[PDB]
């Protein structure tokens, strides 16, 4: 769990993410980890919180069968 | 309102306290 | 030390002395049963406890019940 | 009393405790629970066959 | 508000407190 | 307040939502396309859905709420599903029982409940229809319930 | 350790140097002859004499406890005898009358210093 | 067995309690010369007052901060432990001696690395 | 006594690390010690009372010091809606520089009292610091007093003796007359004399409180029964809570309802209250007889309620007995009796807020019913746990011959199984319809969900007179019998505050109260099934019948007969106190979230997003945690970096205690020999051998220890949650 909580939150703050003209760089958390991984509140905030945010508000959409195998995975 | 007393009292309750009361309790065990 | 107590439901039938790894049990000729055996359990200051003679004692509830009394350095079965 | 009599055993503690149960063995050689009877149902133990005495075992018709 | 009150309390229970030992010393 | 729900204004609300949002997916494709064919027969199934709710009581949420008073005008709602459901479950407990007071009575009843006796498992399966008046009329006769049966100490 | 707790010495013969295990772990060496065995604790011991004795005749053993005063006892045989089978010399001790269903309520108990079978 | 060699007999053997004869106190205050010259260490460099020119002095005060309070362990140890009057260090009068030492020189060594922490 | 369990010598003999923790555990287990007999039992638990009280008086000295020392509390009743209530200051040497910044409030650093004392302390009428001191003190020595008496009656020949204690027959006329009668009378002594005059502006402390009566007529004229003078000019509407300004001088007036202002009810009607509750005790505390013999015999009130029916078994004959020489029987009536007091006190704390200015601070009436919402649970689990130690270590089926109680036990067979069947009924019919809700709510469609109108209490708003439902019903219906039975005396104005959506009275209510309600009668029935299956089968049971013989909290049986893992009548402890927090969990979850949907304002964020599951994690967990969970960024802290911290904490807790409740022993018990090899094999710490032999925790404390870090965390979690979510979204 904490080998895939450092992949999935490493890799989209300094690898992942789109990319714009003149070469600039764009992360999906923006370079969130160094200022982050440091503590737990940062941890379970700016990852266990923060990318919630398209999990938990998935209901009506296509993603929502992720949004029941999320509450039920708790169960 | 005396406020030195918390710098007194929180380090001698706080530290000091559970030092020498765990020699009074832990020798304590064997008396 | 826990104290093992044999009760008049014990038919002989040894599974509690071959159950038992301590030699805390062994068998007694006690004229009461079609057997003629009756466990007794002397060297209770031996016994762990571990409640393996009632696991292995085919009777209709337990003849020998084993109450968890004292810990002693035997009793407690440490290694050091 | 009789072998292969159903009976009931008025004995709190056994898992047949007002179950009837056939009986298998009497003996008459005094002995504290002479009479061995076994049951449909099964204990913990996976063990049918207990014993018991007389006044634990009452017959029907 | 003032000082003097909590040197009072403090004597207080502190005479409270010779009270817990004396009651913890007895049972 | 339980407004009568084909008046209720934010339950209209609701359907304009459903299906004018269901139908920003349907900007997508084109007229002959499968999808865009089941999304014609899912705005069916949204107008029908809706309308199929005009005599609910849709609250000031605008979502259709219920009544377990048996009010007889909630009886659909509610009692009559009560009754359908306690049919449906006295017949699969009434099987149930009937069947294991049949293999109770056989030579290996262990084995009965492993390999299920399927000609007398599908008898009782569909025999326990008329349980209403088969459980009275066996509670009448002093063979529905038990007497004497394993108790602990006292 | 040796110095203050009680280290079993488990002496036993046998005929031929087999291996066994012991239950510290790992294998041994099994001189043939005569040989000892300084143990921790009891169960370690006749845990090693089921372990012998389940596999072929290893028998003239016993365990001479050693406590730390210097004096030896015998554990295991104790009588000669193996004790599930049956000596006319063991002397029963702990048992009583009948079964659990005629032990007394501990509300009878409560406040003495007995137990809930003792009758 | 392993680690159990002449080298490892050798060097375990001098060291400031398996060694032959020392005053118990001087036993001690090489115990507290080798840990209160270390204890300076880890609260200068590290510590809350690392910025500040008490970056030494908090050392002193943090160092021996930590000296009394394993001085008043090993009051306990020997206080509850180590009964007889054997006169050495599994004495009560020898631990005491070994604790005094280990406060006198442990200091000592607080202070000579905080007066060393000057060059 | 030798060593440690100065009182066990059967843990004073163990060698191993359990002494201590089995030294710890079983000391106030005074049933269970060396010699102690009854005598010097009674003599030991009465002492040992006395100790408790003090330290209850020693606390709350410390509230009245610290708020008067370091709370702000006089500047509080300046303005009691603006300034936030100070609990006591901090030190912390660990506070670097930016932390103070985060807790200045004026010169104090102090933390923000979220406990609701300010209010009740400016309700009793405390309008100063001063007051406080005096109180203080005033504790202080009430704590004197009662350590003063335990050290006093453990003193041998003021040893009471035990017929003294089985003076149980009038106990009862003293506790009814004396504790509760007087002291709630003289209580209107306090509220007439204090409360009502410092809320009607008068400073009333200790000099006037005898020149200046609280009627400007009193007690001369008033032997002659005109008592309709005291209830004659109410403080009607335009009053503001301290003043004198729109006030009358009535003291009793019994008008019903809040005040305007503060939203909370007049102390005139807690004056008439606490006198009448006073004057109907006083009456009771006359039940039983004494020395003098005009009373009630206890043996001639449960004897003669054997009913000539025949149904319930041979009556109550047997049942004075085992109180009298029971204990945790009547432990367990009054853990029972305290704990439905406390839910009925957290019950009426929101809905009827007692205390001028709450509900206008969010946070303190968020803890206050929370708090007495959990410990409303630990004493029911400790009524109980008492009811099971009573059946084993107490319980006699010889004096209780087919007694009421041998009747519980013939049938608690039934008992257990129908527990059984409506907790498994609420738990396929609130699980059931959270999924069905949640998985229609998924799939695009909130309207296909099952609502059901909860109608039972809609209705039973409507007999209260809440006319927003249409159902037009005794008080709701203002023509009807009740209606009018009460039109001048105190319905007016209790209707205004039932039919106001502001104040936390009989709330508006939707589906979630159906769903949610079901699911508390779910943790009542399961937590029931529980506790009432290891009380009643707490003695023997088919697997053992052995289980009366073994005491309480015995470990198991070993694995014969398939395995006894948690047989005891210590397991239904154990696992219904995780369905203790779990059901108090939900009951705070939902008043929690009930009220940040009113606080807020928003009551269709509830209604429309609390019928499915994804409303609660989303709605209010994950919504309300944001200002949580920022306490403390890498941008910096704020206030709320305590309880941000704590909530962290809490998590650490209660993982913690995972490892003891599913992880057990002799996984340890072979790995402290691994340990003890190491130390006794390696130099320079072979030196340094143990006394007590380490030895891992035996499986009754560390599931015991397990389930204690569960509750620390759960808790903390939990007040942490509550305090951030109300403090970060207000304040
Ligand atoms: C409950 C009481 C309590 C109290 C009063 C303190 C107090 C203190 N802790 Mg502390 N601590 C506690 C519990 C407590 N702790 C607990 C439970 C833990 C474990 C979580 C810690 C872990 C901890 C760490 C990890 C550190 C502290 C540090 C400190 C110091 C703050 C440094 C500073 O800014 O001051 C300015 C500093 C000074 C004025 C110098 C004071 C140095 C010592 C304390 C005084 C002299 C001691 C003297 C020689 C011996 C006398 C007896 C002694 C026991 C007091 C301060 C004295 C820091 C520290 O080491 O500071 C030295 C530090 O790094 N604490
Ligand atoms: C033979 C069918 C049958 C019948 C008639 C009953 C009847 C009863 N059970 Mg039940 N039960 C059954 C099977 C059955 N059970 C099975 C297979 C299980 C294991 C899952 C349980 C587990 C169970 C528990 C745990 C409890 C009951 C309880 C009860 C009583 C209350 C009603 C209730 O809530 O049911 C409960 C129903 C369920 C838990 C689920 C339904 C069970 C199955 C799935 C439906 C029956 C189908 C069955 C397999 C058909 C077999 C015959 C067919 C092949 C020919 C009632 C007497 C309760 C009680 O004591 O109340 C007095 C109680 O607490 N039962
Ligand atoms: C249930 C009984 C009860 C209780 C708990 C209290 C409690 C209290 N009273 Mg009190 N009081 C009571 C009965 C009671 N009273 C009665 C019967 C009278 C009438 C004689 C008074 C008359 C009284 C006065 C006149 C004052 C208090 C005050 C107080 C407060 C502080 C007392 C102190 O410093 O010591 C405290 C909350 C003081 C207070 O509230 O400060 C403003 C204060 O001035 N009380
Ligand atoms: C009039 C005489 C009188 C009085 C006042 C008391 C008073 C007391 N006796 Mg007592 N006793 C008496 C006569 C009396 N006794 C006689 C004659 C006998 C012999 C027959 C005994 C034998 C006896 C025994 C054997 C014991 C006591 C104990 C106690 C104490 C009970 C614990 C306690 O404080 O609960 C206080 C409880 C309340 C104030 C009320 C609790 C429940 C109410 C409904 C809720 C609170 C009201 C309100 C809603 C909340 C206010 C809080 C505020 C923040 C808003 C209490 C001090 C026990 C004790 O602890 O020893 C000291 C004890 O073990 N008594
Ligand atoms: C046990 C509580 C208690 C106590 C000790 C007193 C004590 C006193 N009251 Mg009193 N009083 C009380 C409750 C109490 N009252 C209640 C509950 C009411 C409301 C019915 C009153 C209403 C009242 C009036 C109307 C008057 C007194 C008065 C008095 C004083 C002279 C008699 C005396 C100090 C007289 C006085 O001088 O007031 C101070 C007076 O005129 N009281
Ligand atoms: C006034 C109420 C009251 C009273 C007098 C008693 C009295 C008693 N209870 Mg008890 N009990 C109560 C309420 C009460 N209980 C409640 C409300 C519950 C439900 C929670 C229980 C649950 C309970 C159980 C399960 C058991 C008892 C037992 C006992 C008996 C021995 C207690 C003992 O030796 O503990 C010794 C003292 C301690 C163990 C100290 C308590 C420490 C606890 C375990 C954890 C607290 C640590 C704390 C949270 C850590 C702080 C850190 C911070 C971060 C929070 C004794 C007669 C025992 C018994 O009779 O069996 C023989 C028993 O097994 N009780
Ligand atoms: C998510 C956690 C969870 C859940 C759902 C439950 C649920 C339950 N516990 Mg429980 N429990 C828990 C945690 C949980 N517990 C914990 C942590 C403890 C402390 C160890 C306990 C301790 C405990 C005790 C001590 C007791 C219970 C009992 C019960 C049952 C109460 C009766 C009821 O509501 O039945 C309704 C049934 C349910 C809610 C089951 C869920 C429905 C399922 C998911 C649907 C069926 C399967 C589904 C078709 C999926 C198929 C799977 C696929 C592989 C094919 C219920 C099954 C009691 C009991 O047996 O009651 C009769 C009982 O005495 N629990
Ligand atoms: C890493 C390593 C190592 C280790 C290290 C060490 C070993 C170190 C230590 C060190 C130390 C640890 C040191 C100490 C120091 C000290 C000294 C050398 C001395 C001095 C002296 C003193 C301290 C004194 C004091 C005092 C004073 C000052 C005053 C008075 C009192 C007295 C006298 C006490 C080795 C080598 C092994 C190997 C390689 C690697
Ligand atoms: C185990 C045990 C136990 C237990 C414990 C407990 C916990 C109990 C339970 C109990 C409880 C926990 C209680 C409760 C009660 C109930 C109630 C009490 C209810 C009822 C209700 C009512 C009564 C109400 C109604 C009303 C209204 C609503 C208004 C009008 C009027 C009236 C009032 C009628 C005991 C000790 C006993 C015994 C021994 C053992
Ligand atoms: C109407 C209504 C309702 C209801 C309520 C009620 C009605 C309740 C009560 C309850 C009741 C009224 C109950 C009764 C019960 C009792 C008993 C006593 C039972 C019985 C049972 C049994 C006997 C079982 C058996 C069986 C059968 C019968 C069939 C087959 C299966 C089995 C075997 C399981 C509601 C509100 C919902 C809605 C509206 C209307
Ligand atoms: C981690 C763990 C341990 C290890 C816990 C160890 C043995 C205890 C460590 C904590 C003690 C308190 C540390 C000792 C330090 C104390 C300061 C010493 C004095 C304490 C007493 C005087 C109270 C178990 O013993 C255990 C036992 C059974 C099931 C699960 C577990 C389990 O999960
Ligand atoms: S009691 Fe059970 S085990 Fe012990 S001898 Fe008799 S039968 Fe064999
Ligand atoms: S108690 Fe444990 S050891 Fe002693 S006999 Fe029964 S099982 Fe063998
Ligand atoms: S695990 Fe240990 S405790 Fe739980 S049952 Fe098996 S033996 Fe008894």
Redesign the pocket.
């Known amino acids: 769990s904490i080998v895939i909580f450092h992949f999935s939150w490493k890799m989209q703050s300094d690898v992942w993410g789109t990319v714009t003209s003149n070469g600039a760089i764009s992360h999906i958390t923006g370079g969130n980890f160094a200022q982050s991984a440091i503590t737990i509140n940062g941890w379970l905030r700016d990852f266990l919180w923060a990318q919630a945010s398209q999990v938990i508000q998935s209901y009506g959409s296509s993603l929502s069968a992720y949004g029941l195998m999320f509450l039920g995975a708790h169960f | 309102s005396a406020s030195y007393l918390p710098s007194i009292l929180v380090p001698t309750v706080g530290l000091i306290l559970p030092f020498a009361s765990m020699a009074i309790l832990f020798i304590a065990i064997e008396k | 030390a826990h104290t093992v107590k044999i009760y008049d439901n014990c038919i002989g039938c040894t599974q509690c002395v071959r159950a038992c790894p301590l030699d805390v049990l062994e068998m007694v000729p006690w004229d009461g049963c079609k057997a003629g055996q009756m466990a007794s359990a002397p060297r209770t200051e031996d016994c762990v406890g571990c409640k393996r003679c009632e696991t292995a004692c085919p009777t209709d509830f337990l003849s020998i019940r084993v109450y968890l009394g004292g810990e002693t350095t035997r009793s407690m079965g440490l290694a050091y | 009393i009789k072998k292969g009599s159903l009976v009931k055993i008025l004995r709190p503690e056994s898992f047949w405790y007002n179950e009837v149960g056939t009986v298998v063995n009497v003996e008459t050689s005094k002995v504290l629970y002479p009479v061995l009877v076994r049951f449909d149902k099964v204990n913990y133990s996976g063990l049918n066959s207990t014993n018991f005495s007389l006044d634990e075992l009452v017959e029907i018709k | 508000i003032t000082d003097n009150q909590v040197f009072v309390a403090l004597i207080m229970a502190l005479v409270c407190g010779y009270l817990a030992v004396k009651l913890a010393k007895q049972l | 307040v339980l407004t009568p729900c084909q008046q209720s204004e934010a339950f209209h609300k609701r359907e304009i939502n459903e299906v004018r949002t269901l139908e920003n997916r349907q900007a997508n494709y084109e007229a002959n396309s499968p999808s865009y064919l089941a999304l014609q027969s899912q705005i069916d199934q949204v107008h029908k859905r809706f309308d199929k709710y005009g005599t609910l009581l849709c609250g000031q949420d605008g979502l259709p709420h219920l009544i377990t008073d048996g009010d007889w005008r909630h009886a659909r709602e509610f009692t009559i599903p009560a009754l359908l459901f306690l049919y449906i479950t006295g017949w699969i407990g009434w099987v149930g029982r009937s069947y294991l007071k049949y293999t109770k009575e056989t030579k290996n009843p262990t084995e009965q409940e492993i390999i299920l006796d399927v000609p007398m498992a599908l008898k009782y399966m569909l025999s326990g229809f008329l349980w209403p008046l088969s459980a009275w009329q066996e509670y009448r006769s002093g063979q529905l319930l038990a007497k004497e049966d394993e108790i602990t100490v006292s | 350790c040796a110095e203050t707790e009680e280290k079993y010495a488990m002496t036993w013969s046998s005929d031929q140097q087999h291996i066994f295990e012991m239950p510290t772990g790992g294998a041994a060496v099994m001189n043939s002859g005569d040989n000892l065995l300084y143990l921790a604790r009891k169960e370690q011991a006749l845990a090693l004499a089921t372990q012998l004795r389940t596999q072929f005749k290893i028998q003239d053993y016993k365990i001479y406890r050693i406590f730390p005063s210097g004096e030896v006892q015998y554990l295991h045989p104790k009588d000669g005898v193996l004790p599930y089978q049956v000596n006319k010399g063991r002397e029963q001790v702990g048992r009583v009358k009948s079964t659990i269903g005629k032990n007394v309520n501990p509300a009878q108990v409560k406040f003495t210093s007995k137990a809930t079978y003792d009758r | 067995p392993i680690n159990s060699s002449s080298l490892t007999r050798a060097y375990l053997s001098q060291l400031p309690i398996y060694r032959r004869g020392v005053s118990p106190f001087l036993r001690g205050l090489e115990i507290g010369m080798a840990h209160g010259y270390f204890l300076i260490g880890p609260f200068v460099q590290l510590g809350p007052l690392r910025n500040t020119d008490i970056k030494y002095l908090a050392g002193l005060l943090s160092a021996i901060g930590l000296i009394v309070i394993l001085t008043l362990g090993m009051l306990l140890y020997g206080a509850v432990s180590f009964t007889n009057d054997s006169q050495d260090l599994e004495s009560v009068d020898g631990w005491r001696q070994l604790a005094s030492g280990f406060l006198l020189g442990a200091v000592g060594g607080a202070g000579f690395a905080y007066l060393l922490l000057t060059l | 006594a030798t060593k440690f369990p100065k009182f066990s010598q059967a843990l004073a003999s163990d060698p191993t690390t359990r002494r201590i923790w089995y030294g710890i555990a079983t000391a106030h287990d005074f049933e269970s010690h060396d010699g102690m007999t009854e005598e010097n039992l009674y003599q030991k638990i009465?002492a040992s009372?006395?100790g408790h009280?003090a330290i209850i008086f020693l606390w709350t000295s410390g509230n009245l010091f610290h708020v008067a020392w370091q709370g702000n509390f006089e500047q509080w009743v300046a303005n009691p809606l603006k300034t936030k209530p100070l609990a006591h200051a901090i030190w912390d040497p660990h506070f670097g520089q930016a932390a103070l910044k985060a807790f200045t409030r004026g010169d104090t650093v102090a933390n923000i009292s979220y406990s609701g004392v300010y209010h009740?302390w400016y309700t009793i009428g405390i309008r100063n610091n001063v007051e406080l001191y005096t109180g203080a003190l005033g504790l202080l020595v009430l704590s004197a007093v009662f350590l003063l008496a335990g050290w006093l009656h453990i003193q041998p020949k003021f040893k009471p003796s035990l017929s003294?204690?089985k003076?149980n027959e009038?106990?009862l006329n003293?506790?009814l007359?004396?504790?509760?009668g007087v002291?709630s009378l003289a209580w209107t002594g306090h509220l007439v004399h204090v409360a009502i005059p410092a809320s009607r502006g008068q400073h009333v402390g200790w000099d006037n409180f005898i020149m200046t009566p609280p009627h400007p007529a009193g007690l001369q004229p008033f032997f002659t029964g005109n008592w309709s003078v005291y209830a004659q000019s109410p403080d009607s509407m335009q009053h503001v809570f301290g003043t004198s300004q729109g006030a009358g001088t009535a003291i009793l007036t019994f008008l019903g309802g809040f005040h305007p202002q503060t939203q909370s009810l007049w102390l005139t009607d807690m004056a008439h209250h606490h006198l009448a509750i006073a004057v109907i005790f006083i009456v009771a505390g006359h039940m039983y007889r004494t020395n003098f013999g005009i009373g009630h015999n206890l043996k001639t009130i449960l004897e003669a309620h054997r009913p000539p029916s025949g149904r319930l078994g041979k009556g109550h004959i047997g049942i004075y007995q085992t109180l009298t020489n029971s204990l945790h029987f009547q432990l367990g009536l009054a853990l029972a009796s305290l704990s439905v007091?406390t839910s009925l006190v957290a019950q009426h704390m929101y809905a009827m807020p007692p205390y001028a200015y709450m509900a206008f601070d969010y946070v303190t009436q968020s803890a206050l019913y929370t708090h007495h919402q959990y410990i409303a649970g630990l004493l029911i689990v400790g009524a109980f746990a008492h009811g099971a130690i009573f059946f084993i270590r107490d319980y006699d089926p010889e004096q209780n011959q087919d007694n009421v109680l041998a009747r519980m036990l013939a049938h608690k067979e039934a008992v257990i199984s129908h527990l059984s069947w409506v907790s498994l009924f609420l738990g396929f019919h609130t699980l059931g319809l959270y999924v069905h809700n949640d998985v229609v709510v998924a799939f695009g469609n909130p309207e296909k969900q099952i609502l059901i109108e909860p109608i039972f209490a809609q209705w039973i708003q409507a007999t209260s007179g809440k006319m927003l439902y249409g159902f037009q019903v005794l008080l709701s219906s203002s023509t009807s019998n009740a209606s009018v039975a009460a039109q001048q005396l105190w319905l007016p104005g209790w209707l205004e505050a039932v039919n106001n959506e502001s104040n936390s009275l009989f709330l508006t209510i939707g589906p979630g109260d159906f769903l949610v309600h079901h699911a508390i009668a779910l943790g009542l029935h399961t937590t029931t099934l529980i506790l009432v299956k290891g009380a009643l089968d707490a003695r023997g049971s088919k697997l053992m019948p052995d289980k009366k013989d073994f005491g309480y909290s015995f470990p198991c049986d070993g694995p014969g007969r398939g395995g006894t893992c948690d047989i005891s009548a210590w397991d239904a402890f154990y696992l219904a106190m995780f369905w203790m927090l779990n059901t108090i969990g939900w009951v705070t979850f939902y008043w929690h979230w009930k009220h940040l949907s009113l606080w807020q304002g928003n009551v269709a964020q509830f209604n429309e997003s609390s019928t499915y599951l994804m409303g609660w994690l989303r709605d209010y967990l994950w919504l309300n945690s944001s200002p949580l969970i920022n306490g403390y960024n890498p941008y910096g802290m704020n206030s709320l970096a305590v309880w941000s911290w704590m909530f962290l904490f809490a998590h650490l807790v209660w993982a913690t205690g995972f490892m003891f409740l599913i992880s057990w022993r002799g996984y340890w018990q072979e790995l402290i020999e691994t340990l003890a090899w190491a130390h006794e094999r390696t130099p320079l710490a072979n030196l340094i051998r143990w006394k007590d032999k380490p030895v891992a925790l035996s499986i009754v404390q560390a599931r015991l220890v397990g389930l204690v870090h569960f509750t620390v965390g759960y808790i903390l979690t939990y007040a942490a949650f509550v305090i951030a979510s109300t403090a970060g979204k207000f304040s």
């Open positions: 009465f009372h006395f009280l009740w003294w204690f003076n009038s106990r003293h506790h007359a004396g504790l509760f002291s007091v």
